[PDB]
Structure formats: structure tokens, C-alpha cells
Amino acid sequence: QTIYEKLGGENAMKAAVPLFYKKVLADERVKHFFKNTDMDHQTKQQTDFLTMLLGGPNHYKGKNMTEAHKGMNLQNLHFDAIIENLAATLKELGVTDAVINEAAKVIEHTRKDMLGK
Numbered sequence: 001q002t003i004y005e006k007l008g009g010e011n012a013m014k015a016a017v018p019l020f021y022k023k024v025l026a027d028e029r030v031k032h033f034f035k036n037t038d039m040d041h042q043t044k045q046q047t048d049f050l051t052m053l054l055g056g057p058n059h060y061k062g063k064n065m066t067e068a069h070k071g072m073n074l075q076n077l078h079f080d081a082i083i084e085n086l087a088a089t090l091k092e093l094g095v096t097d098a099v100i101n102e103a104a105k106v107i108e109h110t111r112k113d114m115l116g117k
């Protein structure tokens with residue numbers, strides 16, 4: 001009963017993160033930020049990161065959220081787009097509103113670490 005397990009665990013996270021990128025990469029608000037990103041690497045990192053954040057195993061070895069988005073000067077509308085695409089991804093995969101809201105509430109604390117950096 002971590003949020004990770006409530007979402008369905010490792011197989012669920014492995015399905016969720018590439019679907020979240022399919023949506024982010026179609027979203028006019030954000031898709032261009034990933035123009036030059038190795039998407040295989042990014043999907044691995046973000047899988048490790050959300051797995052750690054939502055109380056699964058902690059194997060995340062990448063940058064902190066300020067370092068990861070340094071120099072992007074990201075704006076509030078970009079963060080809303082990301083959270084909205086993650087919520088729609090979890091909804092499409094059959095997660096209840098309550099469990100999505102629990103997830104979003106944890107992720108929301110990162111917003112001040114990545115905006116405007």
C-alpha cells in the first residue's frame with residue numbers, strides 16, 4: 001500500500017511512463033522541450049524516479065529536479081501540462097481518481113524545484 005503498489009507496481013509503472021511520454025510528446029505546451037532528448041534514456045530515468053518517489057524500490061541515480069531542468073526557465077503552464085498528462089495516462093490505464101490524486105500530491109512538491117531554473 002505505497003502509491004507505487006496501489007498503481008499496480010513495476011509492470012504498471014513500465015506501461016505508464018511510455019504512455020505518459022506519448023501524450024507529452026503530442027502536447028503543444030511541452031513536446032518541443034524533448035526535441036533533442038534520448039527518449040529511451042529519459043524513459044528509464046523517469047521510470048526510476050517516479051518508482052522511487054511513489055514508494056517503490058529506490059534505484060534512481062539521476063540528477064535532482066533543479067539540476068535536471070537547469071537553464072530551461074520552465075513556467076507554471078509547463079508543469080501543469082506535465083501533471084495533466086501523467087493524470088490522463090493513469091486514468092487511461094484504469095487508475096481511480098483517488099489514487100491519481102495521491103500520486104499528484106507527492107509530485108506537486110517538486111514544482112518549486114524545477115520552475116524558473
Ligand code: HEM
Nearest residue numbers: 030033034037045046049062063068074078079082107110
Ligand atoms: C515542467 C515541465 C517539464 C519539462 C518541460 C521537463 C522536461 C525535461 C527534459 C527536456 C529533460 C531532459 C534534459 C536533457 O535531455 O538534458 C528532463 C529531465 C528529467 N525530468 Fe523533466 N520535465 C518537466 C517536469 C518534470 C517533472 C514534473 C518531473 C517529475 C516530478 C520530471 C522529471 C525529470 C527527470 C527524472 C529527468 C531526468 C534527469 C536525469 O536524466 O538525470 N520532469 N525533463
